């Protein structure tokens, strides 16, 4: 995620990769949403179930 | 050489200038001591040959 | 109208004469400093239109507000709404009086100013002209590929 | 000097110093008064200290409660019409303690 001049823009790649942890082989990011927040960010914060 | 700007001086002309008018005079600073460059860089490929 | 805009942004608020004179990419002041702060980079229109029939009454009217006090800058497009009291000398203090100087003061308007000090209505238009699905037209024409 | 005074003029005789030849330090200006009225027009109270000028005029005067508010570039009243006038295109502060 990221928040240049607003445009909110978040990147993923699903993939069930080994599983141990973080991998190592490379994989690519494509871009799902790009929104124009416009707004002050400087905290985050991560829900659960 | 001023090139046809206020001043000599790249912090001087930043610290004294706003952004987007001093913007003009680095303008001229560039394409006048970029040229310089380039002829000094020709002479020396000539006496080099 | 022949072009293809992905957003538009409608900012709208009411000012003074000389501040629409100083409503402009990076300009100086305490309006352009303290209350309203545009990108030097901006690509768009600015709209003001001089309106005494509307911001203005017998006996007065001080429902618009300012900032003149503020910590540190605007950045470009960001709202700050808030009421704190600034810091004068190394004191705490929270209040009105000496040292202790509420943020904001009316922005009072009357029928009988003058021309700088006319309520100037000031609408700003913010257009992103880059490479992305555009919204906004105007006449659309259409040929066979 | 300006403001240690002790029998500030009148604002039908408003006194007018002209300061040349001097550092504007500002905190001298700060230290001695506990303002009520420091707005400014052409520049900042806290961006003064950082600035060069040609020629400084202070002039001092005692006056009541509501004309301080009366004394501001394009106003009007029995002080701003018949005892000080100032211009709507004035460029610098008013110190009201
Ligand atoms: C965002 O919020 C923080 C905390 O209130 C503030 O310090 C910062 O200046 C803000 N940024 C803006 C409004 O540009
Ligand atoms: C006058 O100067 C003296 C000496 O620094 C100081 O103690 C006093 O507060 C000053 N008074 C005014 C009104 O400036
Ligand atoms: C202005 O101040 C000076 C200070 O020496 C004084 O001599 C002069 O009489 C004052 N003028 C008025 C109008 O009070």
Do not use: M
């Amino acid at each position: 995620f990221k928040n240049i001049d607003g445009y909110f823009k978040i990147y993923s790649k699903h993939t069930p990769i080994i599983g141990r942890d973080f991998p190592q082989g490379f994989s690519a990011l494509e871009p799902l949403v790009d929104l124009p927040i416009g707004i002050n960010i400087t905290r985050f914060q991560t829900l659960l179930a | 050489s001023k090139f046809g700007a206020i001043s000599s001086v790249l912090n001087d002309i930043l610290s004294r200038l706003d952004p987007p008018e001093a913007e003009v005079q680095i303008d001229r600073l560039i394409t006048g001591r970029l040229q310089s460059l380039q002829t000094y860089v020709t002479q020396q490929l000539i006496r080099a040959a | 109208n022949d072009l293809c805009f992905t957003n538009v942004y409608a900012d709208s608020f009411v000012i003074k004469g000389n501040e629409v004179s100083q409503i402009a990419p990076g300009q100086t002041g305490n309006i352009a400093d303290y209350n309203y702060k545009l990108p030097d980079d901006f690509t768009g229109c600015v709209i003001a239109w001089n309106s005494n029939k509307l911001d203005s009454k017998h006996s007065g009217n001080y429902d618009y507000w300012y900032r003149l006090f503020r910590k540190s800058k605007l950045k470009p497009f960001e709202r700050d709404i808030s009421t704190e009291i600034y810091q004068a000398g190394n004191k705490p203090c929270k209040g009105k009086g000496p040292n202790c100087y509420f943020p904001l003061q009316s922005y009072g308007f009357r029928p009988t100013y003058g021309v700088g000090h006319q309520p100037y209505r000031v609408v700003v238009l913010s257009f992103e002209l880059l490479h992305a699905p555009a919204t906004v037209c105007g006449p659309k024409k259409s040929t066979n590929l | 000097e300006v403001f240690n005074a002790t029998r500030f003029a009148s604002v039908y005789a408003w006194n007018r110093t002209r300061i040349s030849n001097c550092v504007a330090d500002y905190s001298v200006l700060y230290n001695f008064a506990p303002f009520f009225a420091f707005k400014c027009y052409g520049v900042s109270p806290t961006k003064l200290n950082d600035l060069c000028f040609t020629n400084v005029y202070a002039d001092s005067f005692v006056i009541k409660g509501n004309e301080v508010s009366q004394i501001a570039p394009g106003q009007t009243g029995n002080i701003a019409d018949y005892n000080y006038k100032l211009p709507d295109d004035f460029t610098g502060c008013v110190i009201a303690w």
